Curated annotation (Swiss-Prot), chain A:
Outcome reported for the amino acid change (mutating S723D): Mimics phosphorylation; leading to stronger phosphorylation of RPS6KB1. Increased activity of the mTORC1 complex
Region (Sufficient for interaction with the FKBP1A/rapamycin complex): 576-708
Annotated protein name in UniProt: Serine/threonine-protein kinase mTOR
Gene behind this protein: MTOR
Residue(s) carrying Phosphothreonine: T728, T737
Organism listed in the record: Homo sapiens (Human)
Residues annotated with Phosphoserine modification: S723
Curated annotation (Swiss-Prot), chain B:
Tissue: Broadly expressed, with highest levels in skeletal muscle, heart and kidney.
Complex and partners: Part of the mechanistic target of rapamycin complex 1 (mTORC1) which contains MTOR, MLST8 and RPTOR. mTORC1 associates with AKT1S1/PRAS40, which inhibits its activity. mTORC1 binds to and is inhibited by FKBP12-rapamycin. Within mTORC1, interacts directly with MTOR and RPTOR. Component of the mechanistic target of rapamycin complex 2 (mTORC2), consisting in two heterotretramers composed of MTOR, MLST8, RICTOR and MAPKAP1/SIN1. Contrary to mTORC1, mTORC2 does not bind to and is not sensitive to FKBP12-rapamycin. mTORC1 and mTORC2 associate with DEPTOR, which regulates their activity.
Family recorded in the similarity comment: Belongs to the WD repeat LST8 family.
PTM (free text): Phosphorylation at Thr-44 by CDK1 promotes ubiquitination by the SCF(FBXW7) complex, followed by degradation. Ubiquitination by the SCF(FBXW7) and SCF(FBXW11) complexes following phosphorylation at Thr-44 by CDK1, leads to its degradation by the proteasome. Ubiquitination at Lys-298 and Lys-306 by TRAF2 via 'Lys-63'-linked polyubiquitin chains inhibits formation of the mTORC2 complex, while promoting formation of the mTORC1 complex: ubiquitination disrupts the interaction between MLST8 and MAPKAP1/SIN1 to favor mTORC1 assembly. Deubiquitination at Lys-298 and Lys-306 by OTUD7B promotes MLST8 interaction with MAPKAP1/SIN1, facilitating mTORC2 assembly.
GO CC, one annotated term: serine/threonine protein kinase complex
Source organism of the structure: Homo sapiens
This protein's record includes keyword Protein biosynthesis: no
Cited PANTHER family: G BETA-LIKE PROTEIN GBL (PTHR19842), TARGET OF RAPAMYCIN COMPLEX SUBUNIT LST8 (PTHR19842:SF0)
SUPFAM superfamilies registered for this protein in UniProt: Quinoprotein alcohol dehydrogenase-like
SMART domains: WD40 (SM00320)
Record location of the Glycyl lysine isopeptide (Lys-Gly) (interchain with G-Cter in ubiquitin) cross-link: K298, K306
Name of this protein: Target of rapamycin complex subunit LST8
GO molecular function: protein serine/threonine kinase activator activity; protein-macromolecule adaptor activity
Amino acid sequence: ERAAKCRAYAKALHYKELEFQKGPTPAILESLISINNKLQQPEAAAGVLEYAMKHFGELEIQATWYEKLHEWEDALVAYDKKMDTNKDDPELMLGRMRCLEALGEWGQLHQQCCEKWTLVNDETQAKMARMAAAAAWGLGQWDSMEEYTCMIPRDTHDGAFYRAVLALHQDLFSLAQQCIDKARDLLDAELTAMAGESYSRAYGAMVSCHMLSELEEVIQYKLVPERREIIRQIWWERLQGCQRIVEDWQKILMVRSLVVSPHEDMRTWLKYASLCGKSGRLALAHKTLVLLLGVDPSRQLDHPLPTVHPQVTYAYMKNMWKSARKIDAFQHMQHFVQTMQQQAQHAIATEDQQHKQELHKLMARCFLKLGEWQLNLQGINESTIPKVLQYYSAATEHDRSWYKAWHAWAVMNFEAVLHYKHQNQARDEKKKVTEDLSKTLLMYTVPAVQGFFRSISLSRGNNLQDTLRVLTLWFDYGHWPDVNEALVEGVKAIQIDTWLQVIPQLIARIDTPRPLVGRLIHQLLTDIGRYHPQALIYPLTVASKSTTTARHNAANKILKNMCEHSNTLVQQAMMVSEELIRVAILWHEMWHEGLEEASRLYFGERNVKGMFEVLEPLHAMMERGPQTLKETSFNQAYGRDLMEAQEWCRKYMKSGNVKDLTQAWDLYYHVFRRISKQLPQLTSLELQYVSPKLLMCRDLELAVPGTYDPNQPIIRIQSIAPSLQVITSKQRPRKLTLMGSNGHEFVFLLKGHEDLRQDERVMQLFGLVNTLLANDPTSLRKNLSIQRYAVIPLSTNSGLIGWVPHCDTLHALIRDYREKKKILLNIEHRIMLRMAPDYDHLTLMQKVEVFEHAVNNTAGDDLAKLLWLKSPSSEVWFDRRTNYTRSLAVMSMVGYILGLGDRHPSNLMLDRLSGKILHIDFGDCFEVAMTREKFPEKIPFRLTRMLTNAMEVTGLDGNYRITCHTVMEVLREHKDSVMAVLEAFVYDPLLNWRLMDTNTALNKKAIQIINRVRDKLTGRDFSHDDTLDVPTQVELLIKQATSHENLCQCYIGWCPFW
Amino acid sequence: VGSDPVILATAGYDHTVRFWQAHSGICTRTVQHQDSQVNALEVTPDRSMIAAAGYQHIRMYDLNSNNPNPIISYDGVNKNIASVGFHEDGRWMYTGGEDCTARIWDLRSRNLQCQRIFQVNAPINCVCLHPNQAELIVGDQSGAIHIWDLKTDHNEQLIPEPEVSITSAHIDPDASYMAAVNSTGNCYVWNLTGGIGDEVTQLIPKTKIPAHTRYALQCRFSPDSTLLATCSADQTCKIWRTSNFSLMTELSIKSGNPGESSRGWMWGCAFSGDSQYIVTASSDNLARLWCVETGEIKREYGGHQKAVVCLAFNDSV
Ligand SMILES: Nc1ncnc2c1ncn2[C@@H]1O[C@H](COP(=O)(O)OP(=O)(O)O)[C@@H](O)[C@H]1O
Ligand SMILES: [Mg+2]
Ligand SMILES: [Mg+2]
């Protein structure tokens, strides 16, 4: 019945939203925040209020708006302005108070209660009492409480509760006992009175039921003395565990205040004060701390701070920093630390060793702030570098373990290096120069390496950033002995696992020209061979068939080394990736593209030296003799012609005729016509014609491509399904499918002429991004992720791609809906050309009109509407939407940071079972797509109209935008991890080829690309000088993605109107 | 054609430039203009020939030889050429282009080359020449209005509100007022400090008219200097008094029901010599003749297959 109540809601919300579509009314708008609330969708509803504001300043008083927006701190100062300019107004005062009780402002709430007690109104007199009880409760003043309680009716949940508290102070336990049960039933029956349509009062019922059961433990804490530790444990544990915003915890602690004073609680309140800062209630956290100190809000500001409670001070000081006063904060830290080492070295008479160590750990966590703040106040320069390194090394000493400490020291050292490397690039723009630099860099490089190593070992599981950082210093430092020793030392020390994360990066430098670098890599890879062979074969196999000599050479040495312990795995994997390449582009398919390219160079460029270079491989390729039944049945129907077409071509090579060459082309065009006719008939491939060795395969030890990881039982290729569908396209990819040793099926896409290595590093970046979102509480709260897939490169040409199940391209879902509903597929298109035959040549102004014309004469639902018909129910429909909305905003932000262009309807798709969106085809990364010559993308990410429309109405205000800054928030915090990854494939040797494409050394370009990304992660992505905060930047971006002036300029294929 | 006392020319996405007879609505001759739409039409002060600024060319047909094809074409300039303007004394032609360049063309010579180039960052939407013939006002897509002194080559610039693009500027016969119209839908007016001959020629901000909610597409002063016309994307041409800066007459094609989605933008306008009438170009395939005082549609020029974006209107003796 419970999951049956939400169905009626979900369904009525559909029609309610479909109603809003026809005309936005405050009538609907009311019934909308309500139904989105019963459905316990807090944010989607918050969106409905955002719209309610920007369209109807009609429920009026900007103070009533801030109050409904739970921005109490804004509404208070808005009510003051509304009271000081107006009069007494019994209504304005009630709100002025509701703000104070939400803010935990008992001092002012009690003053405002008593100093204004004419209150001729009786309802004003009735409400008054509920609040002034809690205010009096916070201020101690129990006489004031009972006075105001004796005015609260005993028929209310509130009136029954406040008695239980007054009884507990006055030690009336049986009274308190009964008052709880009666307050429960007055709340249980109240949860049926407004059965659905209530505030955060359904979620605040948890707050009242939590407190009531807690107040029954405060009861347990009065006469019979046994559970003090057991109660304090559950109190403490169900607090680190519990996540309730500031306000509730105040009251929650106020119950615990009846028994345990702050001075005994200590840790309890510091954890609370800690949250008040992190959430953003510093004025409250301060007061919490002042109380624990038993000393001034430091009204004596010039004086030193009380060392009586070392932890509390540290708290105060870090609160002072996050507060305004932060040269003042830094200053109190230098001294505090100095007072702390004294209170250690001297005060410690051995018999105190726990105090000694916790005093040493607090100090470490002090130093780490000291260095952190020094860098913040001063930046990086010849003065601060050895000072912060001082602070960090000092923090490294006092905790020995602790990731942050070692990490920070490594980064500082690594940035000490960068500071000078970048300072010397500054000098050389305008002998003893390099000598000092050598001594300068070797000075900071070695400790950095060391630091990153002991940082990694303390990170097991999550150390991608630091692991990559080791590799920068490693690869980047053409090895001077000192560096290499530390590197060798680390590799010895650090676990082998670490390196799996980083295998494609290691392999990208097998053929390192530097002699000392190479050796370690090779040795490391071979050890990664001894354990975890599998995470190596595929990538090493690819490397071993490389045109670049030193690569495939060095690659083989490792494979040889791996046969000494895993031979047939190397052997199987060898052949399996060999046959898959054969299957990817067949012999005739290689000729078809090869006869096209050859006729361009000759019959349109007069190039025969290049034309011979197109054909000669295709001839030499076949010269090796047919090896499959498909290769032979080709060899009969076409072979002899081609063999003699080369005959004429080599008569021209020596004769230098033009009639010799015309016989060859006579033969060539003949076979072309034959193949071309057979190509739309290529819709399937049988394994027994195309590659027999694969049909041959049974029960291999080779793991199913990109399914190997430790922790998980190896799933191996048990059998390859005999048929591959040929996806009809310009590259005819294959739908290869394998059978697993578990029993499950694993479907793949065998692509033929696409360098999958970029897609790989992206999927890597995504992996990282996924971890980051799994670790931010809110992002984990909302299930925020990116559906990724497996990417197994097979060569520079080909590779495998994981087939995401249950998915259709955005383009597919439309084409079906459009044909079902008898709508011409490209109708917006045909509309545009009918209006403006030369659309592509118009001025921006002219284009916008034509574009707007098309939108105004087509339906913008489609996606929205087919997703409704798709759904088997409506809570499934609603969830699939909530899923879609989020997953998209996730990929909007991340895509932007990556610079992910080319997001047309065939490059993204929808999971038809979760709704979650999924990106494929990661060709155009970084501005690339925008930078291009023909039809530059102005857009940052696709936020097309039918996308916007499939979300909830109030879309971009609701779930989307919120999810945008949540995601973007995470990114800007962990910007270094994100930059480690991206830096690791921009400056990657083999992958720089996608930036010299600005034509249709590179060091300079690669630098920009990376700056561009940093800008995006430090809010400098728009204006050069303003450092824009998240919500602004996000707003700016959504604007940019929505602008008609941007979308009309998009290549027509991108379907800027879908 | 150009022999008639009135010249009225109309061009758009339908590959023709059609000439109309003002007083009737009959179309005299049509010319072929293929490969492009027409962005701006302007009849040379010499009444000899008309200029059709299009995509990467400015083809000029003849108003005398009453039949042939483009006398002159000007090529080798990439992206659209948006505004055309002439110098009274025969031989100068000014253009603004999407290629960020204001260009001066010598009409009495050869070369697809141009006598001068004025480079700005961001596309130029309009180019208009001060009556004194010595200064060119150039409004770009960034929202700057550059005044370029054709003598001193000294460039001076001015941004009003702009972060927003200025769509067209104009300056009245009597050189007392300058107008600029932007994509927000605002119309700026300035007072003209007549420097002229050892020139100061400075601008003093007078009013900002909230002309339109949608794009404002072109602004134009009446010969009179009495009125100011503001065409826009809200299917409207608004006519404002220069004494008052108040709305005098509104012309609109606003359909007649909220669920029509429009059909037609008010792309261009031109006043008659007496400033008694106004000609109107619209994306609904029709040029229109309006009576400025009543706002009565005194004629409708039907002929164009596709939309209209251009007008040229001429009264000279
Ligand atoms: N990971 C995947 N899951 C499901 N289908 C895919 C996947 N990758 C590609 N496809 C299919 O292959 C088609 C073309 O592949 P795509 O990656 O867009 O390459 P290209 O842009 O070179 O055509 C898509 O329209 C889609 O149906
Ligand atoms: Mg694609
Ligand atoms: Mg692609």
